[PDB]
Scaffold this active site. Structure first.
Site, PDB file in Angstrom:
ATOM      1  N   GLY B  11     -13.991 -30.167  -5.912  1.00  0.00           N
ATOM      2  CA  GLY B  11     -13.675 -30.574  -7.364  1.00  0.00           C
ATOM      3  C   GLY B  11     -15.220 -30.343  -7.818  1.00  0.00           C
ATOM      4  O   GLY B  11     -16.215 -31.148  -7.215  1.00  0.00           O
ATOM      5  N   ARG B  72     -11.184 -23.447  -3.002  1.00  0.00           N
ATOM      6  CA  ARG B  72     -10.361 -24.777  -1.827  1.00  0.00           C
ATOM      7  C   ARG B  72     -10.512 -23.904  -0.639  1.00  0.00           C
ATOM      8  O   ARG B  72      -9.944 -22.171  -1.319  1.00  0.00           O
ATOM      9  CB  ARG B  72      -9.394 -24.560  -2.289  1.00  0.00           C
ATOM     10  N   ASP B 103     -16.928 -35.727   0.312  1.00  0.00           N
ATOM     11  CA  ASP B 103     -16.424 -36.008   1.702  1.00  0.00           C
ATOM     12  C   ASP B 103     -15.850 -34.861   3.074  1.00  0.00           C
ATOM     13  O   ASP B 103     -16.280 -34.846   3.483  1.00  0.00           O
ATOM     14  CB  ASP B 103     -16.734 -37.499   2.448  1.00  0.00           C
ATOM     15  N   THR B 127     -20.478 -35.543  -6.511  1.00  0.00           N
ATOM     16  CA  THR B 127     -18.632 -35.433  -6.362  1.00  0.00           C
ATOM     17  C   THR B 127     -18.577 -36.614  -7.919  1.00  0.00           C
ATOM     18  O   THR B 127     -19.852 -37.501  -8.214  1.00  0.00           O
ATOM     19  CB  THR B 127     -17.922 -36.017  -5.391  1.00  0.00           C
ATOM     20  N   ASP B 129     -16.609 -38.935  -8.311  1.00  0.00           N
ATOM     21  CA  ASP B 129     -15.603 -40.354  -7.197  1.00  0.00           C
ATOM     22  C   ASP B 129     -16.702 -42.065  -6.889  1.00  0.00           C
ATOM     23  O   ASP B 129     -16.064 -42.791  -7.428  1.00  0.00           O
ATOM     24  CB  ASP B 129     -15.270 -39.649  -5.662  1.00  0.00           C
ATOM     25  N   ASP B 131     -17.219 -42.324  -4.108  1.00  0.00           N
ATOM     26  CA  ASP B 131     -16.406 -42.239  -3.052  1.00  0.00           C
ATOM     27  C   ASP B 131     -16.847 -42.063  -1.665  1.00  0.00           C
ATOM     28  O   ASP B 131     -16.424 -42.204  -0.433  1.00  0.00           O
ATOM     29  CB  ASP B 131     -15.241 -41.882  -2.752  1.00  0.00           C
ATOM     30  N   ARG B 173     -10.187 -40.753  -7.643  1.00  0.00           N
ATOM     31  CA  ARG B 173      -9.060 -40.290  -6.514  1.00  0.00           C
ATOM     32  C   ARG B 173      -9.048 -42.125  -5.383  1.00  0.00           C
ATOM     33  O   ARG B 173      -8.591 -43.294  -7.522  1.00  0.00           O
ATOM     34  CB  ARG B 173      -9.813 -39.557  -6.079  1.00  0.00           C
TER      35      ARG B 173
END
Lengths: 318, 318
Positions: B11, B72, B103, B127, B129, B131, B173
């Site tokens: 993304g 993707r 990640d 990103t 996120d 995250d 997410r």
């Protein structure tokens, strides 16, 4: 600790209101009454103090500026004047005062602590400079940084294709972080800061050496600490031709809705200021150091510059 | 180390281009040749690799998105497929690969390192996120945070005075930082995140308990990790009346010009990624930890949540 006052002082910065909002709400949450001091330290003399409720700071997080006002109070540099201020607080049962502003703002707050062991004082870094010790970042930096990006982007968009030189003055007082961070971000070719010996010869040597080499515009960001934008356009003719947009951004940098960065930052330090008053501490400046919220003595606060990032900024302009 | 490749994957996030720009310029500065891999890991198979010059990344710092595309490539989860990719790089003398993404993106970069001791790999956290392990913040967070503020401010301004409930879905997410940081910043009454047990009874118990108590609008920010905005408006009727704006922000959060925060952050980590390749390191993710730029093993990266700030966010809503 059952009565807290709060003021904003010095040049205003984005997130000041967020900070106030946080103090008010946190305090009230802990069953502490909170008093809004209006017009900075001026209001502290004029006795322009007023209780604040939860709703008094509704619809302010996003507010640019300060809704309690700020004043310049040079007379506050005088024990005898300060004695009046102290009494105004001392007469209303206020045992704690929170102060949101520059390192200047902090001064008088240290005075009050020394001059009255009753009144606890705490400093919150509401300023654009970044120039306070014991905090990596101050409340207003990020917003200012983004204002400058935004302004710079406009000048670009509203300029004709001829002027290929934008000599842009950023507001750092004596600290070159804004200019560095904003220079980097707008892809400035040259960044002029107090902390690096400024080789005007070399600078024009690089506009001349890349703009008869066919790019669209080059931009020069300038820390107001180093020089005026007019001084640099003078200093730059004295080798090469440039007589193109010399933008003197100024006080717009202090307006506008704080960014996310400053809303959170302000909120966090407003809360923490209140905790520290509850924990019986005094004469400290709060901040964020190494991604940890911390407190630092006004002593240490009065008793730095990433040359690597500067060097990188340059590495990235062709 | 004389040939480096770079891709963007997963993304897209604001500052991805800034990051690329930094890699390209830094590398070239150090007399390293640099190859743009187009369409993520897909392009890595398709052999969609192309040398990049200084000018190839002109006028990109401010660019939203990624100009090398992202794909993707689920098939990349297969040794035998990866063998092709590896060769494409191995045939052109590329000894290093830089990877800007989630990640997820990092995974395949670790594979390549294990599966080819020639090719050094480095991961940069592009990103929204937040995250990723071993970085306090990722490239796109701050921008996203400000996008949400901005979107939220619009809905406010384009709404009528009746709807007094804005059930706003933020894109985290599985990580509630965006929702927390954005909730705080927009003065949300309620914030719904994976990391805190969500008491819908108590939530409506607080809209009901402050909005027949006379405020203008209340807002509920929701981490997509926890639930959909439609799920929460359902879950919230099942006690009280609210059938008002349920805004599903989505992919707009991924567009737009990176903020200052991300331009600098990206730039710094793009430079640092290049250094680490020169210093012969491999299979690490770069980031910023405790206001220090650092590198962290993909090992550690695969083998947190400020409840205090959450608790504060709530302290600040009446």
């Amino acid at each position: 600790m059952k009565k807290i006052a709060v003021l904003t002082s010095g040049g205003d910065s984005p997130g000041m209101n967020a900070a106030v909002r946080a103090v008010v709400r946190t305090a009230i949450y802990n069953e502490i009454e909170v008093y809004g001091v209006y017009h900075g330290y001026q209001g502290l003399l004029n006795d322009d103090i007023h209780k604040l409720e939860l709703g008094s700071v509704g619809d302010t997080i996003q507010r640019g500026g300060t809704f309690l006002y700020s004043a310049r109070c040079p007379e506050f540099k005088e024990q005898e004047v300060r004695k009046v201020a102290i009494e105004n607080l001392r007469k209303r049962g206020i045992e704690g005062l929170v102060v949101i502003g520059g390192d200047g703002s902090y001064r008088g707050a240290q005075r009050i602590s020394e001059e009255c062991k009753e009144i606890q004082t705490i400093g919150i870094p509401g300023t654009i400079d970044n120039d306070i010790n014991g905090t990596d970042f101050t409340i207003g930096f990020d917003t200012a940084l983004n204002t400058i990006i935004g302004l710079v982007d406009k000048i670009r968009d509203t300029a004709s294709s001829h002027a290929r030189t934008f000599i842009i003055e950023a507001m750092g007082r004596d600290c070159g972080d804004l200019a560095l961070w904003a220079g980097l971000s707008v892809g400035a070719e040259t960044i002029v800061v107090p902390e690096v010996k400024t080789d005007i010869k070399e600078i024009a040597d690089k506009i001349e050496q890349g703009i008869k080499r066919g790019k669209k515009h080059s931009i020069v960001l300038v820390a107001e600490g180093c020089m005026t934008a007019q001084d640099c356009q003078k200093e730059l003719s004295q080798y090469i031709n440039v007589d193109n947009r010399v933008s003197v951004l100024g006080h717009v940098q202090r307006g506008g809705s704080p960014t996310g960065a400053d809303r959170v930052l302000a909120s966090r330090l407003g809360g923490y200021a209140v905790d520290l008053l509850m924990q019986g501490e005094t004469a400290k400046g709060v901040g964020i150091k190494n991604n940890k919220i911390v407190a630092t003595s006004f002593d240490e606060i009065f008793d730095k510059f990433d040359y690597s990032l500067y060097e990188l900024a340059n590495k990235l302009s062709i």
